[PDB]
Amino acid sequence: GVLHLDALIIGSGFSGIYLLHKLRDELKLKVKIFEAESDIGGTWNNNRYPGARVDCPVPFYAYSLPEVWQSWNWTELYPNQKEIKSYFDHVDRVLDVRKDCLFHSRVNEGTFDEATGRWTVWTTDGKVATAKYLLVAVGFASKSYLPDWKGLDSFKGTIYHSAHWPEAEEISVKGKKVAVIGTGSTGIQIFQEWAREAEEAFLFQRTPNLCLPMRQQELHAADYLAECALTFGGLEYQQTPKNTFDASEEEREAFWEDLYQMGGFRFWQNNYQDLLTSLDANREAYNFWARKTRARIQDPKKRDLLAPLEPPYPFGTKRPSLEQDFYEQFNKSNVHIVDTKSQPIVGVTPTGIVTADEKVHEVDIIAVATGFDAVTGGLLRLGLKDVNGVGLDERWKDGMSTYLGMAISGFPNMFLPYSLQAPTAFANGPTLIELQGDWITSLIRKMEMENVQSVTATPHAESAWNDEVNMIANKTLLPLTDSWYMGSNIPGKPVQSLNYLGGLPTYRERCAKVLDEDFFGFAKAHH
Ligand SMILES: Cc1cc2nc3c(=O)[nH]c(=O)nc-3n(C[C@H](O)[C@H](O)[C@H](O)COP(=O)(O)OP(=O)(O)OC[C@H]3O[C@@H](n4cnc5c(N)ncnc54)[C@H](O)[C@@H]3O)c2cc1C
């Protein structure tokens, strides 16, 4: 019948499984996960496209729970999706997670009743549950956008959409002419895999992606995870506490070559402290990146499209993609880069893709690598309502805001790990997830001990958080990056939410104040 719970968790990714564990095992609550799709792992169950791979190195892209890490070993510094999914299998063997998940349970309505202090939640297939706490751990959905190109139904080959990548069987590209449309991380990853094996490979690029070198390595069979957890982003390092132009030119060059050789996010998060605050410092860094990247590319036309001497946006204002041998692919004669800023795609024929200049690029297989939605899309389809009955879509039509990235005014007893206005895209996920999950767990403990029936962020605390978020961003180069333009003007590009850029140590202090000052920023109601 109707399922009644202490807490209901939506999603079985890193976030929701951590919460299940803390709320069920540590707090001894009655808890279930409603999960939309077939199995655990979140984005790692959902996004199985070729090349899918982490961007944070072992051992950071993992839980810090000793029972989990005890017996696990990783085969390489930056594991792939299949190996992440096998880690989730390990988590389930250790923590016993699957038996408290209901799969194929896509939430499509939530409403809160102030008199009882409980949510009532419905799935698309008709499941219905009630719960005191609602933990919305939906991450970032895929962007399910198929551009209105003419002639797609005439195409004689096949079109795959990284919003629903097949599984069952790998798509073989041997002997095939292929196209990737899109240059976010998804596009970069698919293209690297496919450019290696396809008979011919076209990447359709509107803006260049400023990719950093991964430096992959094979690996072999507590205090350290604790000290890294104290950094800006939760990686092993943070910014170098010096201004760019306080170093001489030669010192800069040698410092940047060291970063670039270590690889991964060193160049982004171990760089000079004014990388993201001074446009000139930023441009000097960029000029380095371009020099190194262009040196890898033999054809001058390809070089200027992939790594222009003038930057397309301030480097580091977005989470950079990583790459292994992407730029080298283009030195093959059958590997092409098509500039769709200049010559947009205007159509598909039976044999290929047609650009505005009427050039036909013949292919057998097309991957649409639209990449991820803003955080907004996925949360708005939940059909959540505030206590006055208003949909979150309507609440947010004029801009989205939150308290701490984790609560929304008028949605009581509802918490959002790994979501907007939180350190999210500027941090290591799992470290933020555990931080928010621990906090949510402590906040629930506190309510249960104090007999608090509901807590709801106040419009004031929300507006104040939004003002801190904005103020931190205003001091950086973020207002000058091209994301905002694209979201406001360009069809298919969703409006992004600002991350909190204050760093995990400040973010922690803001969270702690809630627990130490009597639910500071929330209105409370008692049982
Ligand atoms: C290829 C790739 C590589 C990445 N590597 C890194 C990295 O190295 N470092 C890092 O910091 N981040 C990384 N990320 C970002 C990654 O999203 C997060 O690290 C993290 O996995 C998010 O976990 P989550 O559980 O919050 O969200 P998700 O993993 O997205 O899980 C959300 C869950 O909610 C479910 N869901 C959505 N809607 C509903 C609904 N209506 N009802 C029921 N369930 C629903 C989804 O099906 C899903 O199972 C990577 C992302 C990808 C795609």
Numbering used by the authors: 9 to 229, 240 to 545
What did the original publication write about this model?
In addition to this typical reaction, they can also catalyze heteroatom oxidation, including sulfoxidation and N-oxidation, as well as epoxidation reactions. BVMOAFL838 has a clear preference towards aliphatic ketones and phenyl substituted 2-alkanones (aryl ketones where the alkyl chain is at least two carbons between the phenyl and carbonyl group).
The crystal structure of BVMOAFL838, the first of a fungal BVMO, was determined at a resolution of 1.9 Å. Despite numerous attempts to co-crystallize BVMOAFL838 with co-factor and substrates, none of the crystals analyzed showed any electron density for bound NADP+ or the substrates used. BVMOAFL838, similar to the four bacterial BVMOs, displays two Rossmann fold domains, representing the FAD and NADP binding domains, with the isoalloxazine ring of FAD positioned at the domain interface. The FAD is bound with the re-face exposed to the substrate binding pocket and the si-face on top of a conserved Tyr69 and Trp52 forming conserved hydrogen bond interactions with the ribitol moiety of FAD. The catalytic site Arg337 and Asp63, implicated in stabilization of the peroxyflavin intermediate and positioning and guiding the cofactor and substrate during catalysis, are conserved. The Arg is located in the “in” position and forms two salt bridges with Asp. Partially covering the substrate entry channel of BVMOAFL838 is a loop region (residues 449 to 514) of which the first half forms an α-helix structure. In BVMOAFL838 the mobile/“variable” loop adopts a position similar to that in the CHMO “closed” structure, where part of the active site entry channel is closed off.
